Amino acid sequence: PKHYGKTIKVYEYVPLLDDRNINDQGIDASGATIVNGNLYGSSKDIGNITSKLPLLTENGGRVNRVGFTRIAREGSIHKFGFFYEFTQESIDFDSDDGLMEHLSRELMNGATQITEAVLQKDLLAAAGTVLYAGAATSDATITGEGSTPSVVSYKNLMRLDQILTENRTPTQTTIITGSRMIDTKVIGATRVMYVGSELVPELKAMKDLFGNKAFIETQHYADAGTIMNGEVGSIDKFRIIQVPEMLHWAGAGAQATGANPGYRTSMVSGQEHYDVYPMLVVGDDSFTSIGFQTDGKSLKFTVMTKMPGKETADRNDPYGETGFSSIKWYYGILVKRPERLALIKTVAPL
Amino acid sequence: PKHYGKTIKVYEYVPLLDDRNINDQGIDASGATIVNGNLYGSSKDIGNIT
Amino acid sequence: EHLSRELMNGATQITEAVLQKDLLAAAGTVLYAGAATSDATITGEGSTPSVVSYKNLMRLDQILTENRTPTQTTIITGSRMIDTKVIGATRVMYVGSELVPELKAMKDLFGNKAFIETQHYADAGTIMNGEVGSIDKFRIIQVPEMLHWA
Amino acid sequence: PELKAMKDLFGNKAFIETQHYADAGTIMNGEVGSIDKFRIIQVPEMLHWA
Amino acid sequence: MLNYNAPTDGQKSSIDGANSDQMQTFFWLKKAIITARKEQYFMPLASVTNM
């Protein structure tokens, strides 16, 4: 609604037994005061559990005490717009009529594309779970030279699946059982992952733990299965979707010497650096859009057009030979559960 | 058709965000004139887009 | 309302943990992977690391057969669908989340892969809750809250 | 022949002949096989630069 | 011009003075995020004996 600023906030309530629940209400079984309120954190040690179990005698007074905690989130909105202008002679004397229709169509298409790019970059920036291929620990440490290149592998995908399963993230899809046609195989993949067009050959060259081919194309399981739009294959538990306009960081990697084995590089400040690619996974109920006077939609576009004539006459132009057209909108995003977003940063072959 | 010579011509309209869109009608968010009219070409760089 | 809900959830989780630790303590048949003979002798560095292998599972099945323990599950015969394998797993095994990659990477005596995923035998078979696959005679079940000595 | 001798990423046979997928599919005129995502058609009178 | 600049940050609205600030800067959903109960596998196995 209006008159409330540009921010939306919400509470999240932590369970009793997590590590995030920190407080000073604890009282151990002996009756003494203790530092931590929760009985035990996300610890599976049998010794710790045995030490911190709540036990009672016949008369239990001030023996075991607990506490609770809550967390808050937030998000904001922004404003965008652009315009163009023309004259009356350019319209009257031009070779073909209908130029205005072409200009308006291109304007609207550009607006939609910019909106999509703006949303995607925010989603990439707000990722919670991040893995770095190889031995890298940050963007600057990602490199394609040395003993261990920063290239995605089977074990990285397995670890990402393990983390997502630990976070109790819901599964998007179901497994596929085989068909009766020859050269058709089964694929038990239950999640959806988006990749750019540059990473597909590297995925095709991947091998599993036993040296077999790991990337199964869509023609193998097209029968007895449903193919998503843009799907190219499936690896392990993920189904690969190819996005035409997937973005990347150029020059964010380490410096590139002459020992480059064939990975893409870009020039930054006269020096050559490697590229980094997203490999994004989006879980269910991860985020939501903020709509400001959008009538229950994500975006609403406002267009104002003024043609040449008396309405454009002014002191600076007494004759009124100019006009214009403009477009603007509002956008904002709120992320509820950041842990459901996953990301794997890696280099791509040239 | 007859009586029109031996040549046929057509138009093609390029989109707004293409690299073939070269022009002088450009003002950046600050308000200063810039060389390129299209916001950005066929560039997927996050830094350039930002 | 939030406080009461979290209190009840914590109580249920605590009771589950207590039951699990009692069951682990009251075990009758114990095998140590590798050359170890006790907890202190378990190690991961040396000539023979104490990591589970095919022969240990065979020995466990042999001991359970000698003990006359009843069988939980029946075998699965093949299906008509292409790329479907037969499994004759008979007993149920509970493992933690950490051991699953190790179980997947394990190979049998002759070098082939031992782990069989659920997608292969989902047809012409029934899939239990939280089941990742079957190895040899056992059907592996993944329990999120499995406890370990540290 | 050069296409038939081609190797894929793993070192196996990239070229696939028409007899494998002649059933459950329609063979175009002059088709000799398929490589990757292209279907190869052989033209008797293809020209070249000498 | 009177501007609403960035009251949350160091900037202040044009109408606000040295001793004033905006009362409402954000909005509250009132719908809290909660975590579901864990699942337990060992409990269904047990059989009850009366004492």
From Swiss-Prot, chain B:
- Top-level division of the source organism's lineage: Viruses
Which residues constitute the signal peptide according to the record? none
Record localization: Virion
Q: What does this protein do?
A: Assembles, to form an icosahedral capsid with a T=9 symmetry, about 60 nm in diameter, and consisting of 535 capsid proteins.
Protein's name in the database: Major capsid protein
What organism does this protein naturally occur in? Enterobacteria phage N4
Question: Which gene is the coding source of this polypeptide chain?
Answer: 56
Q: What range of the full-length protein does this chain span? A: 52 to 101 of 401
UniProtKB/Swiss-Prot annotation, chain D:
| Superkingdom of source | Viruses
Q: Subcellular location, in the record's words? A: Virion
Describe the function of this protein: Assembles, to form an icosahedral capsid with a T=9 symmetry, about 60 nm in diameter, and consisting of 535 capsid proteins.
User: What name does the UniProt record give this protein?
Assistant: Major capsid protein
Specify the species.
Answer: Enterobacteria phage N4 (Bacteriophage N4)
Swiss-Prot record, chain E:
Its protein name is Major capsid protein
Organism equals Enterobacteria phage N4
Phylogenetic placement of the source organism? Viruses, Duplodnaviria, Heunggongvirae, Uroviricota, Caudoviricetes
Tell me what gene encodes this.
56
Which part of the full protein does this chain span, and how long is the full protein? Answer: 1 to 51 of 401
Localization recorded for this chain is: Virion
Quote the function comment for this protein.
Assembles, to form an icosahedral capsid with a T=9 symmetry, about 60 nm in diameter, and consisting of 535 capsid proteins.
